[PDB]
Design a protein around this nucleic acid. Structure first.
Lengths: 99, 192, 203, 193
RNA sequence: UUGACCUCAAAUCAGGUAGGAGUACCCGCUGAACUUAAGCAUAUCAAUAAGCGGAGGAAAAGAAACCAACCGGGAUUGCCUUAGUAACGGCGAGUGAAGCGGCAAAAGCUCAAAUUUGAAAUCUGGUACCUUCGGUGCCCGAGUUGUAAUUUGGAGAGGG
RNA sequence: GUUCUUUGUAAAGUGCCUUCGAAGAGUCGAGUUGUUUGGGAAUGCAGCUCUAAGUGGGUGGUAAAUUCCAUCUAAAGCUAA
RNA sequence: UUGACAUUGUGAAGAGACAUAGAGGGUGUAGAAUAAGUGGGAGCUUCGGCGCCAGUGAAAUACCACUACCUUUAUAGUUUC
C-alpha cells in the first residue's frame, strides 16, 4: 500500500521487498468441482427442507426482503449468518417451484 | 418400521419384496463368480512359486479372476468412474441412517438399482458373512445374455417406481385387536 | 469413504421426513438400562476418527442419567450465609454434568481405558452420551501398529481426570486472554503467580 | 482510620502468605548438578554440542533497538536453497523451524548466508562406524556474533531541498485520519450525473 | 412337514482384568464461617480450610483458529523484570492477569475424512518348535456397516 | 577397535509441467439464569430453548450492522530435558 | 402454585375479535331531505355542474381531518380454545 520508509505519519509499515511466494494451503474451502456439488444434489434433494425454513420461504417473496430477514435473524441468534443462510435460500426457491 | 404406523418417504421399500422366480436365477448367476476361500488360496501360493516368484511373471501366466462387484456404505470409485450396474440392498440394516440415501446413489447416475432382501447367502461367495451389491463391468460372453435380460426386468419393476413412491407417504396396514373393534364400529354406524 | 454424504446429514433428522426416525433413535436408548452389554457401533462415522480398528475391542456404551442440575443433600440449606451466596436451588451447578456419562461408568472404565465420547440423541428427562472404550490390557492394543502409548502409564482414567475428550470438549486452556484463567489449574494459577518469590540474595 | 498523606499499600499483605511464600534457595544447587550433566550427561553422553548455531533473528518494535535474539530453526525455504533436504538436516544438526516459512528478503539474506559459514566448515561422518575425533567445539550459539548492519558512516555532506518534516508529518497524520471525510464529499459530488 | 449370518445370554478351564493405605507437590468437580468494614446487604477473606476419587513417578498445561502494528512474529511452565498507573469494590477497607525486551533448558510425531478390486498382505487366542519385554508354520474367531499400507495444515495423495 | 551375516533389480527423501485442493456433525456463535474471576454492558466451567457454513469459520482485552484487507485450521489422542 | 417454547406426531378440524387500502346506513321536532358535539365559508380540474339558488330558520347540503363503526368478505397465515 505504498509505504513511507521513514517515521510513521501517513502510511503504516515498512518497504518490505517480499518475494511473495506461496501463501497458505486452505484459503478457498469451497469451489466448483464435481464432488462438492454432487452431495447436495443427491442428499439435500431427499429431505428437501426443514420445518423452520418452510415458513421463511414464504416471507421473503411475499412479505418483502426486510422484516422477513429479521424473523430469521432472531431465529438463529445473529445477523452475521443472514447472508450465508438466507441468501442461500434464493437458489433453493428457484430450484423448486421455478425449476 | 413398515408394519405399524406410517413410513418415511425416503425409504418405503422394505414392504416390497422380490419374487422367487427371478431371484432364483439371480443367485445362481453369482454362483460361478466367487473368489477362492482362504483354505484354497494360501496353499496355491506354493504352487506358483516356480512360475511367478522364480518364473519372473507378475500377473502374466495366470487366468483372469472374474469377480463380481460389491460395496454398500462404502462406494466412491464406483460412482465417479461410472462403474455401477446391478445394485442390491441389504436386508436387516441396523444403521437406520445408512439406508435413506442408497437409492439416491443410483437414481442420479441412472444406475439400475434392484430392491432385494438378503446379503447372508451372497456373503458365502465373497468369503465373508455379509454381502452387498453385485454388479458386472467385465463379464464374460458365457453369461452375457443372462445379464442384459435381467436389466429390462429391474428397470420395469424398480426404476419406474421412485418418484411416485417419494411423493406418497404409505400406510393403511391393519394392526391386530385394534381392527377388531374399529372396523366393527363403522359397520354399525353406517348400516346397523 | 462414503461418509461425505453423512456430513450433510445434521438437521435432516428433524426435517419433515426423518423426524419420525428421531424417536426411533432415542427408542433403544431408553429401553435399556444404564450398565449393560453392547456390540457393533451404530454410527461408523463418529466412532472411527477417534480411534478405530476392525477387531475385538472398540465398542459403544449406553449410559442413561437425568437432565438438569443438582441439589446438595443439605438439611433444607445447611449453608445459609449471605443472601447472594444463598440459594440451594439458585446453586444451579457450575462446572460438571458432561463427563457424567463417564464419571459413573468410570468404575466400569477403571478396568479399561476410555478412548473418546460423543452424543446421539436426547429428550427432556434423560441424557444419552455414547462413549467408546479401549481395553489397555489387550495384546492387540498393546501391539497393533499405530498406537504405542497405551502400554506406557499415560491415561488418567477418564472419570476423575477432568481433561476428558468431553472435558477438553470445552476448557479453553490455550495461551491467549480467554485462556489465562485455568492455564495452570485452580490453586497454582493464583497461589503461585501471586507469590513474592524472595531468594537468599535479597534486594 | 485515616492514613493522612501516605501511600496506601495495596499488595499481597492481608492474605495468609506465611506459608504461601515459595522461597527458592537453589541457584547454585541446580548449577553444578546441570554442569555435572554438561560434562557428563551432555559430554560423555551423546558427544554433541548443546547450544547449536542458532538463526540470528532480530528483535523488532521501536521500544527496543540494537537487540539480538535466537530462533528454533532455519525454516524449509532456506534449507531448500542451501544444498540439502529437510529430512537430511534432521540427521546432521541443522536447526529446522516449523508450521510455516518466511517471505521477507532481509531474513533470507541473513540466515542462508550464515549456513554457508557452517555447512562448509563441517563434514559428515559415515554410518559404518569409524568417525574420528578432531576436537569439536561445544559452543556454536555464541561463536559468530552478528550486530545491526550500519548504513552510512558519520561523514555525510549537507543535503537539503525542502525538509519541512514537522509541517509534512503534521499534514500526513491529518491525511491518514481525514480519508473518509474529504473523499466522502468528493465521491458524492462526482456522482452528479 | 426340515440346516446358516446380525442382536440379546449362561461356567469351577488355558490366557486377563476390578474394589485401597500413605500421599509433599499438582489437577478435575462440588461447596462455609470468623477477621477489616465513615451502621447492615455488595465486596474482601476465598475459584479458601477440612473431606473424597482417579492418574502419574513429577503433575497440569504446551509443537498454534496463539502473540503484534513492528526492524513482521518462531512452542509450554517457573525465577528476575514488565508491575503497582489503568480495571473491579456502598470506587472505602481490598483484590489485581496477559503481550514486547532479556536469561536458563531443546531433536519432536501421527487416525478418520481416502476401496489393491485382474490373488484379506498386518494385529488378537490355542498347540508344536525356538534364541521368550520375541520370531516362523498349520488350524479358528472378529472382519463387505472396509481393515491394512502410504499421508498430517510446514501441504499431502493419485499419473506421464 | 574385531569376528560372525547379503537385507536389495528394495525402501525413503529432493526438482519441473498438466490434471487439483479433501478438513471431525447438537459442535461453534448468539440470547437467558447461576457460580467464579484481574478483564471495564455476557473471560473460563456446568445445564437448557432456538440454532452454523463449503470461493468457509473464528480470534487477536470494549457489544452490533454495511463496503475491503487479515495473526489460525478447532470441537481427537500421544509426546525428553 | 401459574404460563410460552422444546421434549412430542398429525391437519379431514364446529363457532369469534385484528395487524395496509376502496362502496354500503349516520333517519329526534320542523324544513318533501343523510343540518351527526366542534372546526373550516374564497375553493379543487377552470368551456360547462355546486360557489350564497327560493319557503323555514339557533346550526344549511363538493372540498386534506381528532369518529362513537348495526351487519359481511378479504393473499402467503395466526399464541391460548
Amino acid at each position: 500500500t505504498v509505504k513511507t520508509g521513514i517515521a510513521i505519519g501517513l502510511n503504516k509499515g515498512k518497504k518490505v521487498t517480499s518475494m511473495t511466494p506461496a501463501p497458505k494451503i486452505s484459503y478457498k474451502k469451497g469451489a466448483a468441482s464435481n464432488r462438492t456439488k454432487f452431495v447436495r444434489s443427491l442428499v439435500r434433494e431427499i429431505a428437501g427442507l426443514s420445518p423452520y425454513e418452510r415458513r421463511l420461504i414464504d416471507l421473503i417473496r411475499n412479505s418483502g426482503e426486510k422484516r422477513a430477514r429479521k424473523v430469521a435473524k432472531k431465529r438463529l441468534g445473529s445477523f452475521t449468518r443472514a447472508k450465508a443462510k438466507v441468501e442461500e435460500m434464493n437458489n433453493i426457491i428457484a430450484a423448486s417451484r421455478r425449476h | 418400521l413398515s408394519i405399524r404406523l406410517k413410513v418415511p418417504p425416503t425409504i418405503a421399500q422394505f414392504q416390497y419384496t422380490l419374487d422367487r422366480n427371478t431371484a432364483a436365477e439371480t443367485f445362481k448367476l453369482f454362483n460361478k463368480y466367487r473368489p477362492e476361500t482362504a483354505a484354497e488360496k494360501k496353499e496355491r501360493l506354493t504352487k506358483e512359486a516356480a512360475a511367478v516368484a522364480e518364473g519372473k511373471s507378475k500377473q502374466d501366466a495366470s487366468p483372469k479372476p472374474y469377480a463380481v462387484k460389491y460395496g454398500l456404505n462404502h462406494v466412491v470409485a464406483l460412482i465417479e468412474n461410472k462403474k455401477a450396474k446391478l445394485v442390491l440392498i441389504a436386508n436387516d440394516v441396523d444403521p437406520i441412517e445408512l439406508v435413506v440415501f442408497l437409492p439416491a446413489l443410483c437414481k442420479k447416475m441412472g444406475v439400475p438399482y434392484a430392491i432385494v432382501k438378503g446379503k447372508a447367502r451372497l456373503g458365502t461367495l465373497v468369503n465373508q458373512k455379509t454381502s452387498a451389491v453385485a454388479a458386472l463391468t467385465e463379464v464374460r460372453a458365457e453369461d452375457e445374455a443372462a445379464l442384459a435380460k435381467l436389466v429390462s426386468t429391474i428397470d420395469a419393476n424398480f426404476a419406474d417406481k421412485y418418484d411416485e413412491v417419494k411423493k406418497h407417504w404409505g400406510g393403511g396396514i391393519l394392526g391386530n385387536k385394534a381392527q377388531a373393534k374399529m372396523d366393527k364400529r363403522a359397520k354399525n354406524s353406517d348400516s346397523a | 469413504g462414503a461418509y461425505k454424504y453423512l456430513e450433510e446429514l445434521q438437521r435432516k433428522k428433524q426435517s419433515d421426513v426423518l423426524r419420525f426416525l428421531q424417536r426411533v433413535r432415542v427408542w433403544e436408548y431408553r429401553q435399556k438400562n444404564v450398565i449393560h452389554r453392547a456390540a457393533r457401533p451404530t454410527r461408523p462415522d463418529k466412532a472411527r476418527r477417534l480411534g478405530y480398528k476392525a477387531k475385538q475391542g472398540f465398542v459403544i456404551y449406553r449410559v442413561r442419567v437425568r437432565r438438569g442440575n443438582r441439589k446438595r443433600p443439605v438439611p433444607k440449606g445447611a449453608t445459609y450465609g449471605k443472601p447472594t451466596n444463598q440459594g440451594v436451588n439458585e446453586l444451579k451447578y457450575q462446572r460438571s454434568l458432561r463427563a457424567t456419562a463417564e464419571e459413573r461408568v468410570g468404575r466400569r472404565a477403571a478396568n479399561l481405558r476410555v478412548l473418546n465420547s460423543y452424543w446421539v440423541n436426547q429428550d427432556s428427562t434423560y441424557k444419552y452420551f455414547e462413549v467408546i472404550l479401549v481395553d489397555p490390557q489387550h495384546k492387540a492394543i498393546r501391539r497393533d501398529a499405530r498406537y504405542n502409548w497405551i502400554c506406557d502409564p499415560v491415561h488418567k482414567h477418564r472419570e476423575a481426570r477432568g481433561l476428558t475428550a468431553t472435558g477438553k470438549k470445552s476448557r479453553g486452556i490455550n495461551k491467549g486472554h480467554k485462556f489465562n484463567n485455568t492455564k495452570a489449574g485452580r490453586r497454582k494459577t493464583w497461589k503461585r503467580q501471586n507469590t513474592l518469590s524472595l531468594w537468599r540474595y535479597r534486594k | 482510620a485515616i492514613s493522612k498523606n501516605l501511600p496506601i499499600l495495596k499488595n499481597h499483605f492481608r492474605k495468609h502468605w506465611q506459608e504461601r511464600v515459595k522461597v527458592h534457595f537453589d541457584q547454585a544447587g541446580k548449577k553444578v548438578s546441570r554442569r555435572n550433566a554438561r560434562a557428563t550427561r551432555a559430554a560423555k553422553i551423546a558427544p554433541r554440542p548443546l547450544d547449536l548455531l542458532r538463526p540470528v533473528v532480530r528483535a523488532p518494535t521501536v521500544k527496543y533497538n540494537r537487540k539480538v535474539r535466537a530462533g528454533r530453526g532455519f525454516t524449509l525455504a532456506e534449507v531448500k536453497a542451501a544444498g540439502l533436504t529437510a529430512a537430511y538436516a534432521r540427521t546432521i544438526g541443522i536447526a529446522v523451524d516449523h508450521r510455516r516459512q518466511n517471505r521477507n528478503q532481509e531474513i533470507f539474506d541473513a540466515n542462508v548466508q550464515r549456513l554457508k559459514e557452517y555447512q562448509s566448515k563441517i563434514i559428515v561422518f559415515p554410518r559404518n562406524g569409524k568417525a574420528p575425533e578432531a576436537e569439536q567445539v561445544l559452543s556454536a550459539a555464541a561463536t559468530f556474533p552478528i550486530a545491526q548492519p550500519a548504513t552510512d558512516v558519520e561523514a555525510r555532506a549537507v543535503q537539503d531541498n525542502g525538509e519541512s518534516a514537522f509541517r509534512t508529518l503534521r499534514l500526513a497524520r491529518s491525511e491518514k485520519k481525514f480519508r473518509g471525510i474529504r473523499e466522502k464529499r468528493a465521491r458524492e459530488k462526482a456522482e452528479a450525473e
